[PDB]
Design a protein around this ligand. Sequence first.
Ligand code: ADP
Ligand code: MG
Length: 855
Amino acid sequence: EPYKVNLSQDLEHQLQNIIQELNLEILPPPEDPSVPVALNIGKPSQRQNQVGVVPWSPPQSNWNPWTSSNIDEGPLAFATPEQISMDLKNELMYQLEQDHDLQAILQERELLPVKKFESEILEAISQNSVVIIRGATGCGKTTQVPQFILDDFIQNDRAAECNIVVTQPRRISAVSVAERVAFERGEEPGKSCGYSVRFESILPRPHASIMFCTVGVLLRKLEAGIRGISHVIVDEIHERDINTDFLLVVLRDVVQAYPEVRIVLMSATIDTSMFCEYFFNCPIIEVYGRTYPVQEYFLEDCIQMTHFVPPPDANCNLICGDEYGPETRLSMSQLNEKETPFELIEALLKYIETLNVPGAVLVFLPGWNLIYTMQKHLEMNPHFGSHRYQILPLHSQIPREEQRKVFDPVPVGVTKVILSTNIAETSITINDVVYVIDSCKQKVKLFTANYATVWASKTNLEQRKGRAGRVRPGFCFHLCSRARFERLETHMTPEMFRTPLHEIALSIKLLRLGGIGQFLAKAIEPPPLDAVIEAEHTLRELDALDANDELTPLGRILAKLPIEPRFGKMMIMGCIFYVGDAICTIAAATCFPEPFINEGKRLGYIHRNFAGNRFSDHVALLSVFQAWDDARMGGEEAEIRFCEHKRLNMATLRMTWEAKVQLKEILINSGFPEDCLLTQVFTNTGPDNNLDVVISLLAFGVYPNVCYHKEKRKILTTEGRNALIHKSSVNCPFSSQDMKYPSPFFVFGEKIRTRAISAKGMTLVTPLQLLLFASKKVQSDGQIVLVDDWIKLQISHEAAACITGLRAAMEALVVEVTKQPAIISQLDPVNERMLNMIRQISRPSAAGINLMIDY
Ligand SMILES: Nc1ncnc2c1ncn2[C@@H]1O[C@H](COP(=O)(O)OP(=O)(O)O)[C@@H](O)[C@H]1O
Ligand SMILES: [Mg+2]
């Protein structure tokens, strides 16, 4: 049944007036109501784009390739290549013979499997434009190959002619490796090695230097070209990271027009024929060391040996071999294959210690969520205390201090257990690993108009098995049944086949590489047609691309921003409404976890409070940033005490803050005036129109995530399906479900598809805000308005038509703004009134809502 909307008469007239002034019309109600009318309305030429190549040039002595600028005012300013080379060599020779701690480290370096192949690798790279380096995870490709290359130029008095850029799929990899390589050279990051991820960098010195970076960073720098680089090392190509795949397309055209460049493709033990053929049948340098066999097991076995009994495609736990016992069979059938059996892992750990062979256990799990769950299951049991066990988590989102703990040795008599994601599959190798427990799962992000746990591939299961066979004969415990193993895919589908292409689409256009479809048709494995059509559709709707699929001034800005394009447009809209800072903060916050420390899953009494009365996880977040920033004014310890008092993750806040500042930077440079991006005090209780607008702009950004509240935790999603409010939400009630929301309409940040469907990052919006920014299709029969063919509003046909008219006027202003962003200082009066009407519609009062008194 429809939702009643109580507009005031004065508001009803105001809408009608501004529409009249904007020179728009109210489409009349339909003569026959059974045939409704579309209130949502629509509304250039430039050039055409042919095939182009990204330019290349080798290292120059008067050029810093990492800052992309000249060296005029330095101590190596007008120096000659030879002095630079000779100085850097003598520096190093000296360091080598004096530093006895460094010598020891270099001795460790020289035992790694890859050391053997040093000469073979350097010669190959010397000869051929492209080389593939192939070998097992742990031989030392990532850490050593870039050093081999650098040191080769240094020792041979060519140090000035060597700048190596190394790409990595993941942020934590570019940083960790940069720090590890720096340490192996007795340095801090910032000398010979550096890193550059989104929102964080420690640039290395301009000469004889290695930069580790994520592909996105490298891509976003490429519109200048690949300036002053001699080697491009594309690492971990076998992960089929979509941006790596894309970059490989760019680099193929590069090597073809500039054969003096050196590309180095580095890969785990897979069939690299794909990549070989792609790069003109390039050499393949094989690398290996000693492997020991690993006795692998499956969900059957695990139950057979532990004598486990659980608590009271098709399901593959119902299928078991005859050679297994009756209880094993009956026990395995009790387990649900959508979960990972945490009790069985505990049992397997106990089986391990009865083998009496010391060594670490490596446990593969999908996501932090399960690593935390498994952590608490264990620690809340005497046996797994500090005395017997050291249980360390491993994933992207933990302090780098605790990353390095996984490599540290442990007091003897203590089993080290690493609870890890797939980072520890091929990216990093943990030492003294004899045992592996494998969930056989993956946390991929399938979005089709959103995360999800799926089955890993045979290849994944094979490479997880191999982690336990680098020190002695190992064991691997797969938690999937044997019947499930057979129905597994041989390979994970590459991200290129199942990821949105909007960001790649803009990149192609920013770099003037040609048509989106034409370019992506040259990929080693081109993406599906529909994904290309979706990407093109989505960027035309945003006005990122024009009708000819050419890049607009809006699209250009969205391409320069390291954020999802929709959020990029939301940020420009914020600039227009002079709430830029708040929106940049919301945007920045999307790229990091929640700042809140959720010990218990249910949300605490202090965190709730930051919500105020806005029923908004987003407002909560803005409110902590304001309080954290105030608490910051008393220095480090005040910040520290504020954070662990209020139960917050201080690093998250600093990362988000620094992200924001850079997002603002790119806006400033794009022409937007400083005044629209100042920080603005606000309250989360009283009337605040700035925050009202921020909610409206939030509703635009997170669309199409919209939902309707039934009762308790139950909600409805955009296609009529139902789902739950996530426990982490401020809007989530206790075991007693009394919430009494002044509106049932929320927008949200994430769909978490576990066993159930959960909505995360929920923010209450008014029916008016829904109509304005959080809907596309609006249909009126005169009385009832139908929103995105599932939500039904009983509202004035005239009002709906006007709000829908505003939406379109706003979009139109965005276009004009992005041609000359500075004009927001001096908008014409009608546009000013149009902004003010949006300001007015954003108020809770505008929909007859009052937040200040308890409902
Ligand atoms: N931060 C680190 N701490 C300890 N050992 C490390 C670290 N980084 C790399 N190693 C060691 O280096 C070796 C693997 O080097 P790496 O270049 O990562 O191999 P791959 O060829 O798999 O890329 C292993 O012995 C691993 O434990
Ligand atoms: Mg590696």
